[PDB]
């Protein structure tokens, strides 16, 4: 809880390393909630393992480091990076900004034909 304690995140072999105060900035997310991320902890290596996409996590971790900047990398597909945001649970307020930055009876019946 905002304590400079270091956290190691392993993405399919790609090693990431950050402070706990960085992830505790957004407690509603996956890596920010100690109860959500513990399902992925490895007590033999003291790290969190994820068997997912590797090029996407650069922007996921930087979303915490910068404080809200969620920018898809130039080499990650749009459909793949968008599915990663929903896994790490960044939020709808953050997902909407990503879409904006990416460029994105009888009365009712007679109203349909016309």
């Amino acid at each position: 809880h905002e304590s400079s304690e270091r956290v190691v995140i392993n993405i399919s072999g790609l090693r990431f390393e950050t402070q706990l105060k960085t992830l505790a900035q957004f407690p509603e997310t996956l890596l920010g909630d100690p109860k959500k991320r513990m399902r992925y902890f490895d007590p033999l290596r003291n790290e969190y393992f994820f068997d997912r996409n590797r090029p996407s996590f650069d922007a996921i971790l930087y979303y915490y480091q910068s404080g809200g900047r969620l920018r898809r990398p130039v080499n990650v597909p749009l459909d793949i990076f968008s599915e990663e945001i929903r896994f790490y649970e960044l939020g709808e307020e953050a997902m909407e900004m990503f879409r904006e930055d990416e460029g994105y009876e009888f009365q009712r019946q007679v109203w349909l034909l016309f």
Partner: protein, 326 residues
């Protein structure tokens, strides 16, 4: 229900109740009484016995060491723990440095007349010794055959996690246990801090003082009985907190908790001990006794553990009103 249980997420199997040696061994009770108390605990399935180099200035480990040697119990059938921090007046005889961890544990093994203890604890955190030095020293005594496991005591969850990190960092042995105070009037640590470490890195809790040095027994609602712990030399601090403002307030809440004891067909000490073992993160509770009538009464808390319903647990959290905010 299940008597023996693992000490955290390790292979060391301890009984849910253990007999400590603070105050009693080598101080309050005679050696002939200490032998009788230990033989009762051992003959009843208790294998965990706790001590420290500071208890009775080393006389507690000596008394404990002579009982084990006299009765001829198999060392493989005992789980002996000791705590290292206070080892003499000198400057280099205190703390968690590599010098005192090795010297202090070696001196305890001499008094205990044992080749090794099953667990060696850091009796308190040492802000003067770097974490890497303490973990290396604890790993060293384990690899040298002076101890089987090592744990912490009075460490915050942030410090216990750090020792686990430094262990994984330098391929050393992490700690497996944490001795924390836990009774009806001290709950913030075992019920909030520790359970995260039990699921993350598997550090169990071996709680001490389940009756607040005897306060929960309800023997103080009239005054300070003779021959009790509060009447002992060196325990004026306990007599102060008993007769203080909060002291009488705690005695009032014990009157309500007494009704829960009679309703469950048990005593109040048994209810408080069974109340501690209700958590999966509590690997064992360390008992204390000055006579045989107290001990075998406190052993009966195993009967009360199945009779603990969530309705009763919620009922006690209302009388105390100290439910820690999760």
């Amino acid at each position: 229900l299940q008597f023996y249980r693992n000490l955290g997420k390790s292979g060391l199997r301890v009984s849910c109740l253990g007999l400590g040696t603070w105050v009693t061994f080598g101080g309050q009770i005679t050696d002939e009484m200490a032998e009788h108390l230990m033989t009762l605990a051992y003959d009843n399935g208790i294998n965990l016995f706790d001590t420290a180099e500071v208890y009775a200035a080393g006389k507690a480990e000596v008394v404990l060491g002579n009982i084990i040697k006299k009765k001829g119990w198999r060392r493989s059938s005992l789980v002996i723990t000791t705590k290292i921090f206070w080892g003499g007046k000198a400057e280099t005889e205190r703390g968690l440095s590599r010098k005192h961890i090795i010297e202090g544990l070696k001196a305890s093994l001499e008094r205990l007349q044992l080749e090794y203890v099953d667990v060696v604890f850091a009796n308190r955190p040492d802000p003067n010794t770097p974490m890497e030095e303490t973990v290396r020293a604890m790993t060293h005594v384990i690899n040298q055959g002076m101890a089987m496991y090592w744990g912490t005591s009075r460490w915050s969850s942030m410090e216990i996690m750090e020792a686990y990190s430094v262990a994984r960092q330098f391929n050393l042995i992490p700690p497996i246990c944490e001795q924390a105070e836990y009774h009806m009037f001290q709950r913030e640590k075992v019920e909030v801090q520790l359970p995260e470490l039990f699921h993350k890195i598997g550090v169990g809790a071996m709680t001490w003082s389940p009756l607040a040095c005897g306060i929960v027994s309800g023997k103080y609602d009239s005054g300070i009985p003779p021959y009790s712990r509060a009447s002992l030399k060196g325990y004026q601090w306990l007599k102060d907190k008993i007769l203080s403002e909060e002291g009488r307030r705690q005695q009032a809440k014990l009157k309500e908790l007494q009704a829960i004891a009679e309703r469950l067909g048990c005593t109040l000490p048994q209810l408080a001990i069974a109340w501690c073992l209700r958590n999966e993160g509590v690997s064992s509770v360390l008992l204390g006794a000055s006579n045989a009538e107290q001990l075998m009464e406190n052993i009966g808390a195993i009967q009360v553990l199945p009779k603990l319903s969530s309705s009763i647990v919620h009922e006690i959290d209302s009388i105390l009103g100290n439910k820690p905010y999760s």
